[PDB]
Structures are given as structure tokens and as C-alpha cells.
């Protein structure tokens, strides 16, 4: 919300051209494959994050690594792992079969 110029409740005190688009002052970014060039499809494996090629005449800094969503899911499953571990607690061979 702070990135987008449209919710600048204060006057537009910076450059009126710098904005990467009308919805973002700065580009958030795009996946990049391991060799650093554009990663348009999953099949070519993407590994890093980066800014778009400068087609608007300027390149705005990327505010993200692209791993915030994945990392957030990782913390999610991290704090679910204990409870499911407890509920799991042999378990494949039972004495009912006797």
C-alpha cells in the first residue's frame, strides 16, 4: 500500500515520472532463472528475483526477494509440524491382528 502512488495521502513530493507504473512507484519484481535472465516459464527453473528490463527508460528497485510467500507458508507448516507430530504418536503392526 505504501508503494503505490495512488494512496499517497500527502502531495506527490517526489518525481512524477519515476513510478514504474501508475499502480506502483517501484517495481516489486519478477522471477529470474539461475543464470540471471528472464524466467517466463516454470519449466526453465527460476531461482532468483529481479527487476524487469528497462523498457520505461528507468529501472526501479525491487522491494522483495520473491520468497516472502513461500517463507510464510514455511513458517506455517513449521508451527503445524509439532501438533501433527504429537497426533502421530508399532503403528503399522498391531496386536488386533491376533
Amino acid at each position: 500500500v505504501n508503494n503505490d502512488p495512488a494512496f499517497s495521502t500527502t502531495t506527490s513530493t517526489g518525481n512524477s515520472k519515476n513510478d514504474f507504473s501508475a499502480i506502483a512507484k517501484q517495481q516489486f519484481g519478477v522471477p529470474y532463472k539461475s543464470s540471471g535472465e528472464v524466467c517466463t516459464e516454470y519449466q526453465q527453473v527460476c531461482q532468483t528475483w529481479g527487476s524487469v528490463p528497462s523498457s520505461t527508460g528507468s529501472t526501479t528497485g525491487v522491494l522483495f526477494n520473491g520468497t516472502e510467500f513461500l517463507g510464510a507458508i514455511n513458517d506455517y507448516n513449521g508451527i503445524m509440524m509439532p501438533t501433527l507430530n504429537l497426533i502421530r504418536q508399532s503403528k503399522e503392526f498391531d496386536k488386533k491382528s491376533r
Binding site: 540471471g36 532468483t48 529481479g50 528497462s54 528507468s58 526477494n65
Partner: protein, 56 residues
């Protein structure tokens, strides 16, 4: 064993950032101060006419 290659990926992002602060600042500030220099030179080419006032 993932953590070190996460850090390597971030480390590569800081190389990309270093190349950013190595390059585009040149073009952006050159545009700023060439718009400066243009208004400067237009200010200098201005030469107004002198005046003549005649007393009674």
C-alpha cells in the same frame, strides 16, 4: 542444508543491486541535471533590450 544456498541467492541479489547502483543512477541524474542545464542556457541566451527615458 538449504540455508546456505538461500543466503547465496540473497547474496546474488545484492550483486544485482550493486550493479543497479553502479549503472542507472548515471542516466537518471544526468536527465535531472540536463533539464537543469537547459534552463540555465536558456536563461543565459536572454538579452533584453535597453531602455531610453526622456525628461520633460
Amino acid at each position: 542444508s538449504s540455508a546456505e544456498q538461500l543466503q547465496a541467492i540473497l547474496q546474488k541479489q545484492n550483486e544485482q543491486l550493486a550493479e543497479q547502483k553502479y549503472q542507472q543512477e548515471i542516466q537518471q541524474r544526468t536527465s535531472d541535471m540536463l533539464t537543469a542545464a537547459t534552463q540555465l542556457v536558456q536563461d543565459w541566451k536572454q538579452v533584453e533590450t535597453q531602455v531610453y527615458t526622456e525628461g520633460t
